[PDB]
Amino acid sequence: LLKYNVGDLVWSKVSGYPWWPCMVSADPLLHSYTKLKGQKKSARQYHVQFFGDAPERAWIFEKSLVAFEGEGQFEKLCQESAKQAPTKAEKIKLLKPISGKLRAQWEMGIVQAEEAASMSVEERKAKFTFLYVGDQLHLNPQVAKEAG
Ligand SMILES: Cc1ccc(CNc2cccnc2)cc1-c1ncn(C)c1-c1ccc2c(c1)OCC(=O)N2
């Protein structure tokens, strides 16, 4: 009984980054969207696409994944992550708003994620699945036009 499937939108928490809007996808080289690290039933990973103008992808642990509904969760997500922080300096970083190129990318990515939430699982897959040509990770030309 998998929690997520190709197309499902999720918030991903990576260490050293804020919570990010994502979408579960099939790995272009491995062809899988979920794995078990070291065959440990607990350590399940999901291949996700990170919403934004400078796109990325990664195998994220399921324990670091929250179902995405909208940007309204972001604040409550930062509050929980700040509750289990090891220092006051860690709690400040998590509660401090995103800035610089990361902020501009996060907001642009929030636009695509919320746009995809209002679509069918196949409509959002067709619109926001990345296109890959060799080692090149490309955005869908319509998505690239909407970003810049
Ligand atoms: C998976 C991932 C891969 C690579 C890198 C390094 N990127 C990079 C690129 C060029 C120069 N310097 C650094 C980061 C990450 C990553 N890990 C966790 N998070 C939250 C990210 C991440 C951060 C920002 C964006 C993103 C993913 O995807 C879309 C986007 O527009 N912005």
mmCIF file of all heavy atoms in Angstrom, residues 12 14 17-18 20 50-58 102 105, ligand 1:
data_model
loop_
_atom_site.group_PDB
_atom_site.id
_atom_site.type_symbol
_atom_site.label_atom_id
_atom_site.label_comp_id
_atom_site.label_asym_id
_atom_site.label_seq_id
_atom_site.Cartn_x
_atom_site.Cartn_y
_atom_site.Cartn_z
ATOM 1 N N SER A 12 8.781 18.526 0.405
ATOM 2 C CA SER A 12 9.982 17.756 0.730
ATOM 3 C C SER A 12 10.881 18.524 1.688
ATOM 4 O O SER A 12 11.262 19.656 1.372
ATOM 5 C CB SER A 12 10.794 17.494 -0.534
ATOM 6 O OG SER A 12 10.204 16.543 -1.403
ATOM 7 N N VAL A 14 14.516 18.816 2.948
ATOM 8 C CA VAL A 14 15.904 18.445 2.791
ATOM 9 C C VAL A 14 16.679 19.252 3.809
ATOM 10 O O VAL A 14 16.323 20.399 4.085
ATOM 11 C CB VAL A 14 16.371 18.720 1.352
ATOM 12 C CG1 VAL A 14 17.854 18.424 1.179
ATOM 13 C CG2 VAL A 14 15.550 17.905 0.361
ATOM 14 N N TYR A 17 17.762 23.284 3.716
ATOM 15 C CA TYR A 17 16.799 23.937 2.831
ATOM 16 C C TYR A 17 15.428 24.127 3.534
ATOM 17 O O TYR A 17 15.109 23.400 4.482
ATOM 18 C CB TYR A 17 16.594 23.052 1.583
ATOM 19 C CG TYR A 17 17.779 22.998 0.646
ATOM 20 C CD1 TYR A 17 18.596 21.879 0.591
ATOM 21 C CD2 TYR A 17 18.059 24.051 -0.217
ATOM 22 C CE1 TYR A 17 19.674 21.814 -0.281
ATOM 23 C CE2 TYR A 17 19.137 23.997 -1.094
ATOM 24 C CZ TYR A 17 19.938 22.873 -1.128
ATOM 25 O OH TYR A 17 20.993 22.798 -2.013
ATOM 26 N N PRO A 18 14.572 25.050 3.040
ATOM 27 C CA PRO A 18 13.206 25.140 3.578
ATOM 28 C C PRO A 18 12.299 24.045 2.989
ATOM 29 O O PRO A 18 12.682 23.392 2.011
ATOM 30 C CB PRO A 18 12.751 26.502 3.071
ATOM 31 C CG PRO A 18 13.433 26.643 1.769
ATOM 32 C CD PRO A 18 14.761 25.965 1.895
ATOM 33 N N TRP A 20 9.874 22.296 0.551
ATOM 34 C CA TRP A 20 9.725 22.646 -0.843
ATOM 35 C C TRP A 20 8.617 21.942 -1.567
ATOM 36 O O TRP A 20 8.491 20.735 -1.443
ATOM 37 C CB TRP A 20 11.048 22.379 -1.555
ATOM 38 C CG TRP A 20 11.325 23.302 -2.696
ATOM 39 C CD1 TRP A 20 10.895 23.179 -3.987
ATOM 40 C CD2 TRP A 20 12.111 24.498 -2.647
ATOM 41 N NE1 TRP A 20 11.310 24.263 -4.728
ATOM 42 C CE2 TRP A 20 12.106 25.057 -3.943
ATOM 43 C CE3 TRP A 20 12.808 25.161 -1.623
ATOM 44 C CZ2 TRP A 20 12.790 26.233 -4.246
ATOM 45 C CZ3 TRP A 20 13.476 26.328 -1.926
ATOM 46 C CH2 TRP A 20 13.457 26.856 -3.221
ATOM 47 N N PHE A 50 11.395 18.953 -8.029
ATOM 48 C CA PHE A 50 11.250 20.139 -7.187
ATOM 49 C C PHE A 50 10.677 21.295 -8.005
ATOM 50 O O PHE A 50 11.301 21.705 -8.992
ATOM 51 C CB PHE A 50 12.592 20.519 -6.534
ATOM 52 C CG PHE A 50 13.035 19.621 -5.405
ATOM 53 C CD1 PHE A 50 13.624 18.395 -5.663
ATOM 54 C CD2 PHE A 50 12.899 20.022 -4.087
ATOM 55 C CE1 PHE A 50 14.016 17.568 -4.622
ATOM 56 C CE2 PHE A 50 13.290 19.189 -3.045
ATOM 57 C CZ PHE A 50 13.848 17.975 -3.319
ATOM 58 N N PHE A 51 9.486 21.791 -7.639
ATOM 59 C CA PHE A 51 8.868 22.888 -8.383
ATOM 60 C C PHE A 51 9.703 24.166 -8.312
ATOM 61 O O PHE A 51 10.144 24.565 -7.231
ATOM 62 C CB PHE A 51 7.445 23.175 -7.886
ATOM 63 C CG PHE A 51 6.380 22.211 -8.345
ATOM 64 C CD1 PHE A 51 5.777 21.343 -7.453
ATOM 65 C CD2 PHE A 51 5.971 22.183 -9.663
ATOM 66 C CE1 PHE A 51 4.776 20.484 -7.870
ATOM 67 C CE2 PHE A 51 4.972 21.317 -10.079
ATOM 68 C CZ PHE A 51 4.387 20.469 -9.183
ATOM 69 N N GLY A 52 9.905 24.801 -9.456
ATOM 70 C CA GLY A 52 10.678 26.034 -9.529
ATOM 71 C C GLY A 52 11.154 26.355 -10.927
ATOM 72 O O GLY A 52 10.955 25.558 -11.842
ATOM 73 N N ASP A 53 11.808 27.509 -11.104
ATOM 74 C CA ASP A 53 12.308 27.905 -12.424
ATOM 75 C C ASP A 53 13.635 27.257 -12.799
ATOM 76 O O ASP A 53 13.918 27.114 -13.986
ATOM 77 C CB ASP A 53 12.390 29.428 -12.575
ATOM 78 C CG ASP A 53 12.971 30.119 -11.370
ATOM 79 O OD1 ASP A 53 12.244 30.263 -10.368
ATOM 80 O OD2 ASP A 53 14.165 30.506 -11.423
ATOM 81 N N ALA A 54 14.452 26.869 -11.806
ATOM 82 C CA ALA A 54 15.735 26.195 -12.047
ATOM 83 C C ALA A 54 15.525 24.773 -11.543
ATOM 84 O O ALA A 54 15.824 24.485 -10.390
ATOM 85 C CB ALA A 54 16.830 26.887 -11.253
ATOM 86 N N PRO A 55 14.928 23.883 -12.363
ATOM 87 C CA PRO A 55 14.484 22.593 -11.836
ATOM 88 C C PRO A 55 15.546 21.573 -11.446
ATOM 89 O O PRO A 55 16.619 21.487 -12.053
ATOM 90 C CB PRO A 55 13.590 22.057 -12.956
ATOM 91 C CG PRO A 55 14.099 22.688 -14.187
ATOM 92 C CD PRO A 55 14.460 24.068 -13.752
ATOM 93 N N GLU A 56 15.196 20.780 -10.413
ATOM 94 C CA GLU A 56 15.985 19.686 -9.850
ATOM 95 C C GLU A 56 15.088 18.447 -9.598
ATOM 96 O O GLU A 56 13.887 18.488 -9.858
ATOM 97 C CB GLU A 56 16.687 20.130 -8.550
ATOM 98 C CG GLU A 56 17.508 21.402 -8.670
ATOM 99 C CD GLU A 56 18.773 21.330 -9.499
ATOM 100 O OE1 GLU A 56 19.223 20.203 -9.815
ATOM 101 O OE2 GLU A 56 19.320 22.408 -9.829
ATOM 102 N N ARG A 57 15.686 17.333 -9.146
ATOM 103 C CA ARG A 57 15.003 16.085 -8.811
ATOM 104 C C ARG A 57 15.870 15.292 -7.831
ATOM 105 O O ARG A 57 17.107 15.415 -7.833
ATOM 106 C CB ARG A 57 14.712 15.241 -10.059
ATOM 107 C CG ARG A 57 15.969 14.752 -10.779
ATOM 108 C CD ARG A 57 15.685 13.978 -12.053
ATOM 109 N NE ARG A 57 15.941 12.548 -11.878
ATOM 110 C CZ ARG A 57 17.045 11.926 -12.266
ATOM 111 N NH1 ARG A 57 18.010 12.594 -12.881
ATOM 112 N NH2 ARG A 57 17.186 10.628 -12.060
ATOM 113 N N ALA A 58 15.231 14.494 -6.970
ATOM 114 C CA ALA A 58 15.971 13.694 -5.997
ATOM 115 C C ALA A 58 15.126 12.593 -5.383
ATOM 116 O O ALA A 58 13.904 12.665 -5.385
ATOM 117 C CB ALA A 58 16.554 14.593 -4.901
ATOM 118 N N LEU A 102 16.708 31.676 -3.626
ATOM 119 C CA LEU A 102 15.909 30.591 -3.091
ATOM 120 C C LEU A 102 14.463 31.037 -2.924
ATOM 121 O O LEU A 102 13.571 30.283 -3.277
ATOM 122 C CB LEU A 102 16.501 30.145 -1.754
ATOM 123 C CG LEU A 102 16.270 28.702 -1.372
ATOM 124 C CD1 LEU A 102 16.859 27.744 -2.403
ATOM 125 C CD2 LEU A 102 16.830 28.428 0.002
ATOM 126 N N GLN A 105 12.721 31.438 -6.393
ATOM 127 C CA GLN A 105 12.466 30.092 -6.908
ATOM 128 C C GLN A 105 11.324 29.403 -6.144
ATOM 129 O O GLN A 105 10.449 28.811 -6.764
ATOM 130 C CB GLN A 105 13.746 29.238 -6.841
ATOM 131 C CG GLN A 105 14.776 29.569 -7.918
ATOM 132 C CD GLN A 105 16.140 28.997 -7.621
ATOM 133 O OE1 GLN A 105 16.303 28.058 -6.830
ATOM 134 N NE2 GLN A 105 17.148 29.554 -8.255
HETATM 135 C C1 LIG B 1 17.463 18.313 -5.352
HETATM 136 C C2 LIG B 1 18.520 19.375 -5.497
HETATM 137 C C3 LIG B 1 19.477 19.270 -6.503
HETATM 138 C C4 LIG B 1 20.466 20.221 -6.670
HETATM 139 C C5 LIG B 1 20.541 21.323 -5.836
HETATM 140 C C6 LIG B 1 21.608 22.373 -6.008
HETATM 141 N N1 LIG B 1 21.174 23.391 -6.945
HETATM 142 C C7 LIG B 1 22.009 24.308 -7.555
HETATM 143 C C8 LIG B 1 21.938 24.540 -8.924
HETATM 144 C C9 LIG B 1 22.786 25.468 -9.501
HETATM 145 C C10 LIG B 1 23.678 26.136 -8.690
HETATM 146 N N2 LIG B 1 23.769 25.935 -7.369
HETATM 147 C C11 LIG B 1 22.944 25.034 -6.823
HETATM 148 C C12 LIG B 1 19.595 21.446 -4.829
HETATM 149 C C13 LIG B 1 18.593 20.490 -4.647
HETATM 150 C C14 LIG B 1 17.615 20.678 -3.562
HETATM 151 N N3 LIG B 1 17.634 19.873 -2.431
HETATM 152 C C15 LIG B 1 16.649 20.312 -1.678
HETATM 153 N N4 LIG B 1 15.983 21.350 -2.224
HETATM 154 C C16 LIG B 1 14.847 22.058 -1.640
HETATM 155 C C17 LIG B 1 16.608 21.603 -3.451
HETATM 156 C C18 LIG B 1 16.181 22.657 -4.381
HETATM 157 C C19 LIG B 1 16.470 23.995 -4.134
HETATM 158 C C20 LIG B 1 16.060 24.980 -5.016
HETATM 159 C C21 LIG B 1 15.354 24.618 -6.166
HETATM 160 C C22 LIG B 1 15.071 23.275 -6.409
HETATM 161 C C23 LIG B 1 15.480 22.302 -5.529
HETATM 162 O O1 LIG B 1 14.380 22.862 -7.521
HETATM 163 C C24 LIG B 1 13.689 23.855 -8.299
HETATM 164 C C25 LIG B 1 14.230 25.263 -8.207
HETATM 165 O O2 LIG B 1 13.869 26.137 -8.988
HETATM 166 N N5 LIG B 1 14.916 25.565 -7.086
#
